[PDB]
Amino acid sequence: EVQLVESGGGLVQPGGSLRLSCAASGFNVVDFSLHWVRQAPGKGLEWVAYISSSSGSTSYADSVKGRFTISADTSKNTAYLQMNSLRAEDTAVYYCARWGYWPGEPWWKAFDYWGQGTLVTVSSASTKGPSVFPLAPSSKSTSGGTAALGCLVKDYFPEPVTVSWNSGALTSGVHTFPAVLQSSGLYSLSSVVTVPSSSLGTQTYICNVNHKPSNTKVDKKVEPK
Amino acid sequence: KITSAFKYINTVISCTIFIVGMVGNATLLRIIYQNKCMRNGPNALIASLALGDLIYVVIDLPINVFKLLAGRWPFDHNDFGVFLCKLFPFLQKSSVGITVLNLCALSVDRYRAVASWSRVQGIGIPLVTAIEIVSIWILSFILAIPEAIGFVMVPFEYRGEQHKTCMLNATSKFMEFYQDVKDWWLFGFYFCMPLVCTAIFYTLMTCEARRQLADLEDNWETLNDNLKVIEKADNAAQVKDALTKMRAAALDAQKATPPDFRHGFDILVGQIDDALKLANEGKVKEAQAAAEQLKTTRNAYIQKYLERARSTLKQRREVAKTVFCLVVIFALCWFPLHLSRILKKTVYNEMDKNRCELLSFLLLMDYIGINLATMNSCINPIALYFVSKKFKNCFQS
Amino acid sequence: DIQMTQSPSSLSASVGDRVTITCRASQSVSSAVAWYQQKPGKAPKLLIYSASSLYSGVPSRFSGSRSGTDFTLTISSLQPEDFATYYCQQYLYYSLVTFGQGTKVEIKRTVAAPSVFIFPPSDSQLKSGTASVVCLLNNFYPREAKVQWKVDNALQSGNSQESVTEQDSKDSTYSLSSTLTLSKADYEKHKVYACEVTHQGLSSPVTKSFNR
Amino acid sequence: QVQLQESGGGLVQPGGSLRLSCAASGRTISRYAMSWFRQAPGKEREFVAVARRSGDGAFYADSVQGRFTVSRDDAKNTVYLQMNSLKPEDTAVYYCAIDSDTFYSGSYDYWGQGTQVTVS
Ligand SMILES: CCCNS(=O)(=O)Nc1ncnc(OCCOc2ncc(Br)cn2)c1-c1ccc(Br)cc1
């Protein structure tokens, strides 16, 4: 089967270095040309560079010229992309792609098989656990109707953070918003529930916060002021 | 008062049109199949036209001439004469139906002749054309049916003797009201549909043939002009832009190239790609040499392709010219009688004081208008001899 | 260099309708265009070649058309699997490749006004060193809405962060959160706080306020 | 300074069809979106329908979905609201409104006088 795989992703500091590898199975790389494509978080698709090992012809984009180098290895059937002196706007997801040669249909076949993609993020912040804070309603906040509870997590630097309500019990009417990037460089996130009764009957409402990279488990208790 | 001199004129011109229209159609039918390099699509339809006219001129003329020489139909006192009173309208209108439908089919075929001009055809009569001519023949014969029925020989008295006269007499309600709308039927079927259809299809053809040539000229000119621009360039940006335009032009020109020349266009695109790569690396002179390499391929392959294409489209048009010249001559010949009959039915007023002398004029013009229509049956060969420019050598040979 | 533009940024269409997306090229490229579909958390896969050509395995509902420098992608039946982002690409040569911005297709619903709540900062928050005031909009369609902060009847710009949520599969709705961050002096010298919300379903903007 | 006016109204038997047109002058109306509002005693200015810029679409509330239909005519700068299969609860005063944001934020500043419709 025809397959492409990518590797070499992680966390690097600004001005650092990285080396990404793209391996192909099911075909030889001397019958095709290999291209790299970049997608910024919440943006469109962008072209980066390409190489052809039949003639050893390479080209780059204007915004990444002089800092990225591309190479191929026909013995191991692989392509390599070396990145140096990265800046803030270089965090994205990277994809590998194949393109056919001219005299016939395969040129009209454009990009056929895409890679899985590798997430590359650059930052100048350390790893630390978050802080959990309550968001309680008032006695006049829709008395006799529906109230909303919340827990707010702040100042963390993993990519993912896990938030659960009552150890996975309450799920209906719960949605947590995507994390947003603060000015300093860390992240903030919120979780809110919309239970209709704020009485002391079933008002445990424990926010369980899991932060695997810092191996932090936090339990948050809410209380109606 | 009408005199017998015009009767003699009518009979002599009838005897003349017989001779003129017999041998011409016979020799056209001989040629259409005698010469090996002659048979194709439109020519078979022309032969069908000629045969349809030949049946009429070989059956109907030698009874009309006698009817004009004498004052009676053939075999009035014999039963067999009844049969020869319904063949006359049937053949005479079946011929016209065949001619009209064949002209319309020719117009449609000539429009299809340039709608996929890249596609090439074979030789001989196509598979569809034979069934097309068979359908035209059968449809004309069937559509001519409601004229033979009801045409009866009615008795009349003269000099104390009882003789016959052939005319349309009422038999049933549908043919009774048909006797009141057939005049509009003829003018709307044999004169209205063909002219409009041929005019409409002619204009579409003229539009298509025009654009194509414009596109070909645009592609060739942009190729030549961008090559000229690259010839004396100074920087990589302009070379890259001009080579991009040239690559787009080559792809668009190849897309319109029918399946020898495709190999030439592939080689052209390869050389353009080599020039683009050399320019992208960051050199100028090598790009100039690579662009200069394109001249041999341009002067070997593309010029011949352009030549042939232009010449072919010239030929395609000549055929359209012969077809539509035939259409216009048919319309010109068949207009006067229809106008005369419609005007006599509509604008003639019985209460008019001077309606007599005017009618004395009108009848006279009608007495030639009919004749004009008849002449059409023999105008097809001569018109083909002065128009086709290829039947000239056939007739001479 | 060769810029290429997509007209409709977002479409709201339901099951069983037809959609048409137009992509326009700046220069005169040939039929060398291609169409791609992307769903969240996945790599693109392609549908249409050469401005009119179907790939192997793609459903035959997708169609493409070309006219001069304008390219059209048409879908006749909208199955539930056809809710994703689409892209138009030109591939005239290796080093000249340009992508479109993108068009998002979403489900259609009935207009509903947001519900607005506010939350004052907590005691632990105000003893930590920084304070944050949050106010929340729930269960509205369509997406477009605006939130305005007011302190002491004085408008404030900056220090406000907005977060949005994708369409909930249960009801095809949204939620939005606005957080305003201040230092201790900023929260202590001012007195009145409020946030107001404006949506197409609201007759007049709705404000919710609190004091200390 | 934009002047807007809408017509139609009166007493209509149940099940009838009614058309109300809202027109205006003072701005380039073809670049905006216009909305309809319905006010009845005991109800505070409910929303009914909205028509966006040409080529975008129209949206309706749940109470009037299907029965109604909103249409745009940028040549004459008009919006049309067609209603059928009415019910006695419809009886109310209708207002036309024109928003103020090109990003469909939803700010309403110019409001019409409204027409009265009664049924049953
Ligand atoms: C009772 C007389 C027949 N009935 S009638 O009076 O109603 N009509 C006509 N009478 C006398 N001569 C007519 O045409 C003479 C020329 O015919 C002809 N045919 C084929 C070719 Br090739 C060349 N010339 C028509 C006539 C009218 C309309 C049509 Br369509 C066809 C023929």
Author numbering:
A (entry chain H): 4 to 227, 329
B (entry chain R): 74 to 281, 1001 to 1051, 1065 to 1118, 299 to 382
C (entry chain L): 2 to 213
D (entry chain K): 1 to 120
Question: What did the article's authors report about this structure?
Answer:
Endothelins and their receptors, ETA and ETB, play vital roles in maintaining vascular homeostasis. For instance, ETA preferentially binds ET-1 and ET-2 over ET-35, mediating strong vasoconstriction, whereas ETB exhibits equal affinity for all three isoforms, primarily inducing vasorelaxation through nitric oxide and facilitating ET-1 clearance. Therapeutically targeting endothelin receptors, particularly through ETA antagonists, has shown efficacy in treating pulmonary arterial hypertension (PAH) and other cardiovascular- and renal-related diseases. Notably, a specialized anti-ETA antibody facilitated the structural elucidation. These structures, together with the active-state structures of ET-1-bound ETA and ETB, and the agonist BQ3020-bound ETB, in complex with Gq, unveil the molecular basis of agonist/antagonist binding modes in endothelin receptors.
Macitentan, designed as an ETA-selective antagonist, is a derivative of the dual-acting antagonist bosentan. In our calcium mobilization assay, macitentan shows a high affinity to ETA, with an IC50 of 1.3 nM, contrasting to the lower affinity to ETB at 14.5 μM, which is also consistent with the previous research results. The sulfonamide moiety in macitentan establishes a hydrogen bond with R3266.55, and forms ionic interactions with residues K1663.33, K2555.38 and R3266.55 from ETA. The bromophenyl group is embedded in the receptor’s hydrophobic core, forming hydrophobic interactions with residues W3196.48, V1693.36, Y2635.46, H3236.52, and L2595.42 from TMs 3, 5, and 6, and is further stabilized by a cation–π interaction with K1663.33. The 2-(5-bromopyrimidin-2-yl)oxyethoxy component, linked to the sixth position of the pyrimidine, allows the oxygen atom in the bromopyrimidine to form a hydrogen bond with Q1653.32. Importantly, this moiety inserts deeper into the orthosteric pocket than the similar groups in bosentan or K-8794 in ETB, positioned to form a halogen bond with D1262.50. Furthermore, bromopyrimidine engages in π–π interactions with Y1292.53 and the “toggle switch” residue W3196.48. The ethyl tail attached to the sulfonamide moiety is nestled within a hydrophobic pocket formed by F1613.28, P1623.29, and F2244.64 from TM3 and TM4 of ETA. Our structural analysis reveals that the addition of the -NH- group in macitentan contributes to a more stable electrostatic network with K1663.33 and K2555.38, enhancing macitentan’s binding affinity. A comparative analysis of the macitentan-bound ETA structure against the ET-1-bound ETA structure reveals significant conformational changes when ETA transits from the inactive to active states.
